[PDB]
RNA sequence: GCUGCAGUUAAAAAGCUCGUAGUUGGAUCUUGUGGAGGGUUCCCCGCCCCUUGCCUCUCGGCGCCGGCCCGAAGCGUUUACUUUGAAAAAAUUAGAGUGUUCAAAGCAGGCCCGAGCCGCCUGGAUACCGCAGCUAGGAAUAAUGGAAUAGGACCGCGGUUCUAUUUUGUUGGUUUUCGGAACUGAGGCCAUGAUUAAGAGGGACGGCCGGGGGCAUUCGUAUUGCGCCGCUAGAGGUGAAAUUCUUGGACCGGCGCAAGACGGACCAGAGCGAAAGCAUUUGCCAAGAAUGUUUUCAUUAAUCAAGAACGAAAGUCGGAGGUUCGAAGACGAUCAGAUACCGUCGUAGUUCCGACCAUAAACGAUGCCGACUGGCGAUGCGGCGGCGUUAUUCCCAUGACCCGCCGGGCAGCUUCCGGGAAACCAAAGUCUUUGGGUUCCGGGGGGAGUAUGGUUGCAAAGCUGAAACUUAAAGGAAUUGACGGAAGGGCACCACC
């Protein structure tokens, strides 16, 4: 309520809504494309890179742990992304200066859990999954 | 100002019925209000009503009962084409069984139930139940 | 309510339903006409004319002893003025304001009130001039204000 | 309000003491009067709210003094209405 | 968030007003009876005046007995709206039929005879298609239309001019005639033509009202300084001090004068102004609200991009002035420290005149206009009435006080009006039973009123205004505890006297 309800006010409605839609956060990222330019991804679900070097990443309080991530440079941008490594002992199955395949966490822009500064994780080392390396139904191909 | 006369009218008789009254005073008397209340009287929601005459525009006085629950206006006046009808009456009525959307057609002012038997669409004015 | 003040108020005249003569009266339609024409010579304008009849003569109003208004009677002769007194009284006021404004440049209150009365002229002019009661080329300016009030 | 009161037929002045444009029919609250003062011996008729000086043709030359309301008479006499 | 959001306090109404575009806008111009279809009046022909408004007619049919009657031809001032037709590629979709082994599909297929029938039967529907355009019917609703400095009606006549090509068998010279068209006078015939005045607006008129504004003028006391007179030792100041002031004498008391500043008490949930704001006297200059009115005009209105006026204090520029207070600054204290709170001194500023600056908790933190819906007592202004007293010439007119009534204005009290998360609010009410008109504005918390470009300004800055990245809370109302160098009571020799 508190607004026009004319019969010839189609212009004053459809131009107002087209302006006040930009104050929404979601809409403003989709249509400016500043999302694409700023992201290390092109909007692609995955991406591929080459390892730079292992790191240890401290946890946010209350939790205290060391989380053993990696840091990676990409093939098609040359810029750098810091990527989590999953389950116990899977760090060892990643060896420095090889290729890897990365993927987002599942929150689509934001850092997940108690680990800060990480927005990406790792899925395949070299056409072989972290699962089959971990479980033992496959072996290192080298 | 008083841009729409009929829209200011119904709110009085709506307010008055709630408090518990049975006589009112509504001004300034449009012909449109008369034929509205005529249809609303036939079905039985209000009683006989007296039109006072003045040269200015007149004044009308109504005798009413608790049968009425609410009569509203719908403004601005949209068109209906007898397939748009079912969508309107669903939103505006408590039930299919009773309630009466009013409208005006070239065949005169009437309820929606009558207009469907004459195959006449037209401009919608208000409602009641 | 008010069109350049915030106020609201009732003081409007209210006429009776009746409208006979009523009975008690005199000066047939024709008598009233010659009674009027004399007054307009003296500079009495249509509003003043009806007052000076209503206060001291037997009329209730000159619309129930004639079939016409006070102004139409004068207009049929050709003795009506070339602009309505309503417009004239607006312009009549604003010249004195402009004089006072030249004599005193620190009366910002007067300067403010002039903007209202000025804009109220232009609105009124746009009624008459669309209705072919004024030339469609006439405008309001300082110069035209001076000459038209004299 | 007792919330059931009649509005068709009002009391002669207990529901016609109201403002004149809030009545069912609009009536004036003014009247005429047939006056014959004893310094201008003529049957003059004058409106109650004079608004202007009413002149006399006799020895006197004033009959009313206008105020904010009903005009008071100088020494005048004889009030009629008549009827309205 | 069109259907369908929110803006007092949770994110949020431009400081305020004017104003074009845009959007929106009062009331008013026709009803009854037989037949036919459906009740017991009421919804295709007609009738009261009208009835699909008219004519004029002429060419090609229908009639009846040369003469006469009625269908088709111009159309009812113009549109929106609504209703009916026409015209719309397929596939897809909806959907009819059909036993794909059932189904997704597909458009097929089904019948009787040993072959000896040389065959039979049947489908491959229908719907939908924003718009805009084309067609026909309706006349309510919403726009638009006419004769008020008259022309509508009839073969009414005159005056004036132009022109048409038909006929006297044909073809040529002439002249009227007829038809069409154009223009002029005086006269009949029209009921001879104006809807009301909005508990809409504008304007006039009357008597009043107000710390409203501008200009001029008048007055009071204090403060400070100066001069003079009198008495003598301290005076200022603070929690306690000290800086500072002082026998050429301060402070204090008395008398006169000068300068600048300022309008006390009276002065109020009082008034006026659009807001910012506005209190000594008197005069002048223009302005405005409310009320009164059987005056005037006749819809002239509401809200508002563009654009425009005013807009506290501080600040900037140029002049005048400079008592008082006083950022800055210099001192004295307090403090471990003390660039502060406190004391002394003191520049800019504070004041006036002329230009700039456009911002505030510019707060009722509450847009403007209109309608409806409780009670009660007051107050300011106008009008109306009165049983009552008083003031003056005994008077009347009138003022003061008393009582009641009617308007509009600042507010209050009261409650199961109703609403709200609650606090609260007769509006923040009449809202899932959602639509009176219209403008502005909001979308978790930060980043940030920052970055950047535009624009305005002498300067100071104002207006316009992002993102990367970061985070799961930020925030509102209310309740229970604890705490308080908060308030009121009471109590203890593990507290004090």
From Swiss-Prot, chain A:
PTM sites of type N6-acetyllysine: 135
CDD domains: Ribosomal_S23
Start-end of Basic residues biased regions: 1-20
Residues bearing the modification N6-succinyllysine: 54
Keyword flag Acetylation: yes
GO cellular component assignments: cytosolic ribosome; nucleolus; rough endoplasmic reticulum; small ribosomal subunit
Record SUPFAM superfamilies: Nucleic acid-binding proteins
Family as reported in the entry's similarity comment: Belongs to the universal ribosomal protein uS12 family.
Entry function: Component of the ribosome, a large ribonucleoprotein complex responsible for the synthesis of proteins in the cell. The small ribosomal subunit (SSU) binds messenger RNAs (mRNAs) and translates the encoded message by selecting cognate aminoacyl-transfer RNA (tRNA) molecules. The large subunit (LSU) contains the ribosomal catalytic site termed the peptidyl transferase center (PTC), which catalyzes the formation of peptide bonds, thereby polymerizing the amino acids delivered by tRNAs into a polypeptide chain.
Protein name according to UniProt: Small ribosomal subunit protein uS12
Swiss-Prot record, chain B:
UniProt-annotated location(s): Cytoplasm; Nucleus, Nucleolus
N6-succinyllysine modifications at: 87
Keyword Lipoprotein: no
GO biological process: translation
Pfam families named in the record: Ribosomal_S8
Main location (coarse class): cytoplasm
GO cellular component: cytosolic ribosome; nucleolus; ribonucleoprotein complex
Keywords: Cytoplasm, Nucleus, Ribonucleoprotein, Ribosomal protein
Keyword Ribonucleoprotein among record annotations: yes
InterPro entries per record: Ribosomal_uS8 (IPR000630), Ribosomal_uS8_CS (IPR047863), Ribosomal_uS8_sf (IPR035987)
Molecular function in Gene Ontology: structural constituent of ribosome
Family to which this protein belongs: Belongs to the universal ribosomal protein uS8 family.
Subunit structure: Component of the 40S ribosomal subunit. Part of the small subunit (SSU) processome, composed of more than 70 proteins and the RNA chaperone small nucleolar RNA (snoRNA) U3.
Role of this protein: Component of the small ribosomal subunit. Part of the small subunit (SSU) processome, first precursor of the small eukaryotic ribosomal subunit. During the assembly of the SSU processome in the nucleolus, many ribosome biogenesis factors, an RNA chaperone and ribosomal proteins associate with the nascent pre-rRNA and work in concert to generate RNA folding, modifications, rearrangements and cleavage as well as targeted degradation of pre-ribosomal RNA by the RNA exosome. Required for proper erythropoiesis.
Protein name: Small ribosomal subunit protein uS8
Organism encoding this protein: Oryctolagus cuniculus (Rabbit)
Gene (UniProt): RPS15A
Curated annotation (Swiss-Prot), chain C:
Presence of keyword Ribonucleoprotein: yes
GO cellular component, one term: cytosolic ribosome
Location of Phosphotyrosine modifications: 37
A Pfam family per the record: Ribosomal_S15
GO molecular function: small ribosomal subunit rRNA binding; structural constituent of ribosome
Protein's cellular compartments: Cytoplasm; Nucleus, Nucleolus
CDD domains (alphabetical): Ribosomal_S15p_S13e (cd00353)
GO biological process: translation
Annotated positions of the Phosphoserine modification: 29
Cross-link Glycyl lysine isopeptide (Lys-Gly) (interchain with G-Cter in SUMO2): residue positions: 42
Cross-link (Glycyl lysine isopeptide (Lys-Gly) (interchain with G-Cter in ubiquitin)) at residue(s): 26
Domain of life: Eukaryota
Modified residues annotated as N6-succinyllysine in this record: 26, 33
Keywords associated with the record: Acetylation, Cytoplasm, Isopeptide bond, Nucleus, Phosphoprotein, Ribonucleoprotein, Ribosomal protein, Ubl conjugation
N6-acetyllysine PTM positions: 26
Modification note: Ubiquitinated at Lys-26 by RNF14 and RNF25 in response to ribosome collisions (ribosome stalling).
Assembly mode: Component of the small ribosomal subunit. Part of the small subunit (SSU) processome, composed of more than 70 proteins and the RNA chaperone small nucleolar RNA (snoRNA) U3.
Summary of the function given for this chain in its UniProt record: Component of the small ribosomal subunit. The ribosome is a large ribonucleoprotein complex responsible for the synthesis of proteins in the cell. Part of the small subunit (SSU) processome, first precursor of the small eukaryotic ribosomal subunit. During the assembly of the SSU processome in the nucleolus, many ribosome biogenesis factors, an RNA chaperone and ribosomal proteins associate with the nascent pre-rRNA and work in concert to generate RNA folding, modifications, rearrangements and cleavage as well as targeted degradation of pre-ribosomal RNA by the RNA exosome.
The family this protein is said to belong to: Belongs to the universal ribosomal protein uS15 family.
Organism: Oryctolagus cuniculus
UniProtKB/Swiss-Prot annotation, chain D:
Gene Ontology cellular component annotations, sorted alphabetically: cytosolic ribosome; cytosolic small ribosomal subunit; nucleolus; postsynaptic density; small-subunit processome
InterPro entries: Ribosomal_eS27, Ribosomal_eS27_Zn-bd_dom_sf, Ribosomal_zn-bd
Entry keyword set: Cytoplasm, Metal-binding, Nucleus, Phosphoprotein, Ribonucleoprotein, Ribosomal protein, Zinc, Zinc-finger
Compartment(s): Cytoplasm; Nucleus, Nucleolus
Ranges of compositional bias, category Basic and acidic residues: 1-16
Pfam families assigned to the protein according to its UniProt record, in alphabetical order: Ribosomal_S27e (PF01667)
Chain ranges passing through the membrane: none
Binding site for Zn(2+): 37, 40, 56, 59
Ranges for region Disordered: 1-23
Protein name, per record: Small ribosomal subunit protein eS27
Source organism of this protein record: Oryctolagus cuniculus
Gene symbol of the encoding locus: RPS27
């Amino acid at each position: 309520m508190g607004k026009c309800r004319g019969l010839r006010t189609a212009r004053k409605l459809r131009s107002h809504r087209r302006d006040q839609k930009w104050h929404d956060k979601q809409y403003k990222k989709a249509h400016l494309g500043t999302a694409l330019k700023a992201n290390p991804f092109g909007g692609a679900s995955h991406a591929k890179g080459i390892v730079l070097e292992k790191v240890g990443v401290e946890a946010k309080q209350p939790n205290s742990a060391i989380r053993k991530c990696v840091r990676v440079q990409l093939i098609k941008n040359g810029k750098k992304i810091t990527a989590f490594v999953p389950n116990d002992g899977c760090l060892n199955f990643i060896e420095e200066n090889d290729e890897v395949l990365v993927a987002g966490f599942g929150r689509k822009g934001h850092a997940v859990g108690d680990i800060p500064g990480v927005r990406f994780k790792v899925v395949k080392v070299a056409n072989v999954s972290l699962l089959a390396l971990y479980k033992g139904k496959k072996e290192r191909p080298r | 100002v008083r841009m729409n006369v009929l829209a200011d009218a119904l709110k009085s008789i709506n307010n008055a019925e709630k408090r518990g009254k049975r006589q009112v005073l509504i001004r300034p008397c449009s012909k449109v209000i008369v034929r509205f209340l005529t249809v609303m009287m036939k079905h039985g929601y209000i009683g006989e009503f007296e039109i006072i005459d003045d040269h200015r525009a007149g004044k009308i006085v109504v005798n009413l009962t608790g049968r009425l629950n609410k009569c509203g206006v719908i403004s601005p006046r949209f068109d209906v084409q007898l397939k748009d009808l079912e969508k309107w009456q669903n939103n505006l009525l408590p039930s299919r069984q009773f309630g009466f959307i009013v409208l005006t057609t070239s065949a005169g002012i009437m309820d929606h139930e009558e207009a469907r038997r004459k195959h006449t669409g037209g401009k919608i004015l208000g409602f009641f139940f | 309510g008010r069109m350049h003040a915030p106020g609201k108020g009732l003081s409007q005249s209210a006429l009776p339903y009746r409208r006979s003569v009523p009975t008690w009266l005199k000066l047939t339609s024709d008598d009233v006409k010659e009674q009027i024409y004399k007054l307009a010579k003296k500079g009495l304008t249509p509003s003043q004319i009806g007052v000076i009849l209503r206060d001291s003569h037997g009329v209730a109003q000159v619309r129930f002893v004639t079939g016409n208004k006070i102004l139409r009677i004068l207009k049929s002769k050709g003795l009506a003025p070339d602009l309505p007194e309503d417009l004239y009284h607006l312009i009549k006021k604003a010249v004195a304001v402009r004089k006072h404004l030249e004599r005193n440049r620190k009366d910002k209150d007067a300067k403010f009130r002039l903007i209202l009365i000025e804009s109220r002229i232009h609105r009124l002019a746009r009624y008459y001039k669309t209705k072919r009661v004024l030339p469609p080329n006439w405008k309001y300016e300082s110069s035209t204000a001076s000459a038209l009030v004299a | 309000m007792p919330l059931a009161k009649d509005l068709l037929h009002p009391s002669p002045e207990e529901e016609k003491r109201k403002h004149k444009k809030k009545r069912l029919v609009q009536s004036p609250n003014s009247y005429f009067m047939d006056v014959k003062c004893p310094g201008c011996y003529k049957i003059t008729t004058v409106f109650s709210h004079a608004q202007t000086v009413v002149l006399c043709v006799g020895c006197s030359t004033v009959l009313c003094q206008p105020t904010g309301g009903k005009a008071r008479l100088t020494e005048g006499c004889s009030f009629r209405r008549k009827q309205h």
